[PDB]
Design a protein around this ligand. Structure first.
Ligand code: HEM
Length: 403
């Protein structure tokens, strides 16, 4: 009988954990043309838009995070605890219960309500921008999502830098490991983050506000979740809301620095902003791989059998360059009215909780920056994030206008 899965015989191979690998290489394009799904050593990789969108919702595929933790063999400890218990690792009743307590402030209706704050914050950040060369992350891409999360979670607004610094230094992008050197840094960062969070939580336990930390504390007083679930959930929302938005904002500037004519088009027509943001999400999603799933049962799709326990990764970046769906897919173009959205936010039960908030922050940022400033220009060497997950500039030296 068969030595390998018969339906896997023709699947193109890709190794995204290879120093020379690029999502935009011709070999990746060839793979997507040959097959809707590629084989990697440890996981199947979905490359075409239709299947990536559909399978992220497929109930036969649950969260693969716990599978990955066992795959990398993280030892028993605080880092493993967080990685196996946090929202993205859960499914069924536990997931819907915990996600449910964090949903309210992120619903489209409630995002409308925070819009005035976002616009005012963007305006203020632009008012005090430096006038020569400067780090865009330091002066805009970091402050904006840090302040927004502080506002939503009930943290003092002057704590925005500390909160941002705390999120970065958890090094959660490096947590999928069994190396002790890395795991020391991750644990130390998580501990310091929990120090701030527990202090905020204990304060809301006695004097609650209308913020999300206060909301979750009330659920804790109603016995819906325990103390550990409480702090883990707050930590989850904070980290997931900060780094992604930060890097995506920095990628937006990078995209327009490479294509400044399109910046002038938004200045000419501010109405282009939402479409422009969606193009940034299509062209350069901060999470090239969005949904990390695992087969919960044996099933078949397009004649390819996916047995129980198969890790399945949704490759948003490659799916965004699918010419079956997007016209002139490998060209950055904000002017094209597109039928299909980006799938930068994944899908299914785990679909990004702050999707509407993310689009708001990006749209408000882009619209105001383009209306008030000249096109961005790269002003020095960029420091890129070299990790699995969040991608984009950690530091972006630039100037708005040649003079
Ligand atoms: C401040 C705004 C944001 C907030 C509050 C937020 C929050 C969250 C949370 C709590 C989760 C876990 C959901 C779950 O497991 O049930 C999540 C997942 C996710 N987020 Fe975000 N996020 C934000 C911005 C972004 C941005 C800018 C991107 C990239 C474009 C992004 C991409 C994703 C993806 C791809 C997932 C996984 C979805 C899946 O597995 O199907 N998020 N987010």
């Amino acid at each position: 009988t068969a030595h390998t899965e018969p339906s896997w015989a023709d699947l193109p191979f890709l190794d995204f954990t290879d120093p020379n690998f690029s999502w935009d290489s011709p070999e990746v394009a060839e793979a997507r043309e040959k097959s809707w799904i590629a084989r990697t050593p440890l996981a199947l990789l979905v490359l075409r838009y239709a299947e990536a969108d559909q399978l992220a919702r497929d109930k036969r595929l649950i969260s693969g995070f716990r599978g990955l933790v066992d795959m990398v063999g993280t030892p028993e400890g605080p880092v493993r605890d967080f990685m196996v218990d946090f929202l993205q690792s859960l499914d069924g009743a536990d997931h819907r219960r915990l996600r449910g307590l964090a949903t309210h402030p992120f619903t489209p209706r409630r995002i409308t309500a925070v819009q005035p704050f976002v616009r005012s914050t963007v305006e203020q950040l632009i008012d005090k921008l430096p006038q020569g060369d400067f780090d865009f992350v330091q002066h805009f891409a970091h402050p904006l999502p840090a302040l927004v999360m502080c506002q939503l979670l009930g943290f003092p607004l002057e704590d925005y830098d500390t909160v941002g610094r705390l999120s970065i230094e958890t090094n959660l992008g490096l947590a999928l490991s069994n190396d002790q050197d890395i795991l020391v840094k991750v644990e130390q960062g998580l501990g310091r983050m929990f120090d701030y969070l527990v202090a905020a939580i204990e304060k809301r336990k006695v004097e609650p506000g209308d913020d999300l930390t206060s909301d979750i504390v009330r659920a804790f007083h109603d016995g819906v979740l325990d103390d550990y679930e409480l702090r883990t959930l707050v930590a989850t929302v904070l980290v997931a809301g900060y780094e992604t938005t930060n890097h995506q904002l920095a990628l937006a500037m990078y995209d327009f620095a490479q294509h400044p004519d399109q910046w002038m088009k938004i200045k000419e027509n501010p109405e282009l902003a939402p479409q422009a943001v969606e193009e940034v999400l299509r062209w350069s999603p901060t999470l090239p791989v969005t949904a990390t799933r695992v087969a919960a049962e044996d099933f078949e799709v397009n004649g390819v059998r996916i047995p129980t326990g198969t890790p399945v990764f949704m490759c948003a970046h490659v799916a965004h360059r699918d010419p079956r769906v997007f016209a002139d897919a490998d060209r950055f173009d904000i002017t094209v009215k597109r039928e299909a959205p980006s799938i930068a936010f994944g899908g299914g039960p785990h679909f990004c909780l702050g999707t509407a908030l993310a689009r708001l922050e990006l749209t408000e940022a882009v619209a105001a920056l383009a209306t008030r400033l000249d096109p961005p220009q790269i002003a020095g060497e960029i420091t890129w994030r070299h990790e699995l997950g969040v991608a984009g500039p950690d530091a972006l030296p630039l100037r708005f206008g040649a003079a």
